[PDB]
Design a protein around this ligand. Sequence first.
Ligand SMILES: Cc1cc(CCCCCCCOc2ccc(C3=N[C@@H](C)CO3)cc2)on1
Lengths: 255, 273, 236, 236, 59, 40, 40
Amino acid sequence: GYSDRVQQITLGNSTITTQEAANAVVCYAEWPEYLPDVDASDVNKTSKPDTSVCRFYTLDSKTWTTGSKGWCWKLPDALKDMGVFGQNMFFHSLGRSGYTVHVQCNATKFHSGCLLVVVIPEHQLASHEGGNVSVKYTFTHPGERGIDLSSANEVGGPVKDVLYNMNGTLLGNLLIFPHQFINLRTNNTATIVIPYINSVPIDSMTRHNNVSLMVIPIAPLTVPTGATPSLPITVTIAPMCTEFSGIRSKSIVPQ
Amino acid sequence: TVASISSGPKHTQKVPILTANETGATMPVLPSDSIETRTTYMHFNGSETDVECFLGRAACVHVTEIQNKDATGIDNHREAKLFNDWKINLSSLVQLRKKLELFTYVRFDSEYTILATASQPDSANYSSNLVVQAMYVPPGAPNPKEWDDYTWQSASNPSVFFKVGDTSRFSVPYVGLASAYNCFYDGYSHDDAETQYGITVLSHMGSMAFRIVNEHDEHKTLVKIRVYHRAKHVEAWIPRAPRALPYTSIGRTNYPKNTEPVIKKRKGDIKSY
Amino acid sequence: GLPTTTLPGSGQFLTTDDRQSPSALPNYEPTPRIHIPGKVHNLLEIIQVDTLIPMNNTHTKDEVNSYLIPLNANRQNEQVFGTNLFIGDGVFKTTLLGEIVQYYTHWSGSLRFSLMYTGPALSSAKLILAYTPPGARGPQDRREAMLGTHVVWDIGLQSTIVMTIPWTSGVQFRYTDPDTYTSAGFLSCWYQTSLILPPETTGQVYLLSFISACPDFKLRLMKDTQTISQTVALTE
Amino acid sequence: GLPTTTLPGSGQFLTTDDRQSPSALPNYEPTPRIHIPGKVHNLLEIIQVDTLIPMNNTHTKDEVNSYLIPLNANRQNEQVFGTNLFIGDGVFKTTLLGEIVQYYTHWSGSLRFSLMYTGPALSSAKLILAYTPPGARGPQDRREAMLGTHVVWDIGLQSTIVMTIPWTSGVQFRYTDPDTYTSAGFLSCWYQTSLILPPETTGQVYLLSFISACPDFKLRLMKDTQTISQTVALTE
Amino acid sequence: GPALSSAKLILAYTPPGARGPQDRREAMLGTHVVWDIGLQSTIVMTIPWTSGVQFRYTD
Amino acid sequence: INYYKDAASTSSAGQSLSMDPSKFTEPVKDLMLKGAPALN
Amino acid sequence: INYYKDAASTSSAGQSLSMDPSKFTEPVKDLMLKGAPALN
Ligand SMILES: Cc1cc(CCCCCCCOc2ccc(C3=N[C@@H](C)CO3)cc2)on1
């Protein structure tokens, strides 16, 4: 009586149940694991807070309306302030982590709409100015708020044009990245497990984000007659196999 | 190898063509799941689509130019093209760039070919064979100031001398600092409020300096350098969506404003053929 | 001293030749490789992942909407969409498949075309997708369409339908770039019965459509893509 | 006559290639080698010998005094010295380590920083040395400093203290030449308790400081040093 | 609720030492279960014994 | 025959002949069998 | 393959792979053990 459909994920002191899942994606078919010695470089023993950092943090909720263009969060940024995960983050020189991402959106059998939930490794954004204008730090570190693709261009911020993925590629091809759809008629959640993907064994958690999670409405939300025209979307994310190394004074970052 | 097996009528409870794309999978459906097929063999291996093959041919990565002329009274050799210099990079020209950016991280050895041809714009006489010197000036090492500085001694820095009209060829191991080169980097060099964003900060690989060894003749001679790059021993990770809009800058993803629609509009209906 | 003779071609530079060269950095030790998920070995590996087709090409500036094929409730017998199968051009051209095919001169193989339905769960519909092999015109009505490769799709719990365009061909390779002799057919879709919405519901519903290549597929003779060009070298 | 083809690169002179050549002096017999103590095989052998760092760089012309770090009796909580760790520049630059690092482009490894105390034997002191890994600012007070790599040094019979800056890094190599992304941290030193001089004694005492590389160390990609240049050829 | 409705609730247990949470952000950092209302009508949350002292008074 | 000492100086590599699209086409956590229902 | 008769004409030598810093780092007459007191 197991269905692909019902699932439970327990991680730390927190549990999620979905009764309307559509399997789960594990990026590149690899599950998060700690850093092996053969791959290690820094000689420091690392710190593995385990259950105090590897639990589920639910970010603040978004509201899908008929005019929504899509939202974008960066990792580990989105979690920069969650509990002890965040403290560890500002206090060590280097850290590394994988995540379980669970995006939630329920409706009824009269609604229609379909969101794309995708994880993009190394999502370098484009400046809407063109040329070689850079995208300032603050703009690519929105924190739990994430970036709202239907917000206005700002100065020093990225471009927010959806048919171009914020980088000069077409929305249609985002499907080459680990992703899952939430089609109100099928699905009510999306779950993706992200292994740590980098060109170095461990890195800085503040100067470099290693994935952007993106939720994009593709088939517009259509509510039943005289229904309220909107649904909330909630994102809950859990660091998994986290390791921190090179402890010290506590980083100070712009803004 | 069979490309298609033989398959006949079906009346089952087992439907391989109904799936749920919401899952993120592309189910491996074949012609024989939905029509009646006959056996056929592949006769093919997919040899020429190997990434080593795809990135393994020489591509032009840079065209520069230097001239041989009397430096007498020149206050700025660099500025007179008495010796140009190139900030090594692999995204200045776009044919090869779009190919590499199909991947996120890439690792390979490089084979460089350098072709140098001469031009004599101002009606001339006898051209004495010019010899070009190509130095590798990695970051931290004195960079040439005049076309005949102590720098050109290049006692510790690899340099090649070849003749204009000829070609020079040598191969450099993968010089990246990390395990792969980042084709993309969503980071900064530090948490500064105004530091540049992108890979520009990861791309540091220094520059390469060219000059003519010959002193000047009576006329002036323009030498134009073309650098070709071939990846050998390629390793590529994490495929990405291909580049759709035009490029504007080395190292940023930025596209131009008021660009044009990249998807061709139908001449007719959705229903049109 | 061993006697030699040099042949025609000596001194040429062929960008496609593969030989040994002296290393400029004798004895240098590259950084160790660490493990990174996601390694690609063949472009054939990636063109089997499906991506969305902007089938609804009828707009005037690129929009998220050209990915949506609309469906109308209560129409009978009528046609949902049509397209030829020049995978290197037209709707296909910006898709990952289209985009890679363009790096090669010839292609052969089967294509997988699937449609995922997004209408309310309490609605229902039966569509017919038809592949018309080279030699006939794009079908003009379902009767015409239904006599070639087709699948009646019944919209249900299982949200997507995967249609295969089996390789139908005399010549074993076709050019990517639109050739006549080498042309592959048409793909059309019609109401089999009709879309029906539940009460309290209204308007258009949309289908999303994807394209990917079957394991069947072959691409050969690499060349340059018409999809990218430039007028001056970029700088930093 | 055997048929050949010459490739691109024929006739080039690459200063780094390694091939055979005819000897100009056929059959000549070199002088026998005799034994000489001191043979060097690797530059890695010598950068492990420690040499003095002109830490006290604050003078205006080079002097023996910039090797001396002064210490004041009776100060509490305060800071003895500070420096970043750009081994290819600044204090490090003229040291043997600094001087060799400059012949290479990349370095990786642990550094050994030691301090030898020279104050009267009847005095005493407790100092804290702190290494701050990349990512934070140079510490501004001991509280800040003590939260990173540190050693409380107790001045005793044993005159020197050897602090190691363990390799703390994401990227496995850093440039010698000052790079940001690639930067290595800061090194600071503060009074842990304070220097105390015996009676009949007065003034400043000094610490000498050395730097050498751990056996850990790697240097790669040789290049030319900014530390030497010239304007005309020398003559006899 | 009617069978054709849907809902997602979070239940949170806050162990001794902090105040009753004032908003979900605060609540979600302690023991919690996201409950998805479905066919299966009930959700069972456990308040695991979190305690220094091994017994507590009822009163 | 390599004429040169360093590995970078050797010619192009030889075909992976690796080929495994499943990391890209089927990264699902619970295995899907073709023919069995997608969602149970 | 050497094509030439004299030894000077051969290519570069091959890595010492000797490496022993102790003549430079520890030329002390009585052996010092790390961990034992420097001066007894
Ligand atoms: C004489 C002589 C001249 C030289 C040059 C040595 C080669 C050094 C160049 C190293 C390779 O450079 C790069 C630069 C960028 C990238 C890269 N940038 C990203 C888009 C992807 O890859 C890769 C290699 O050596 N000897």
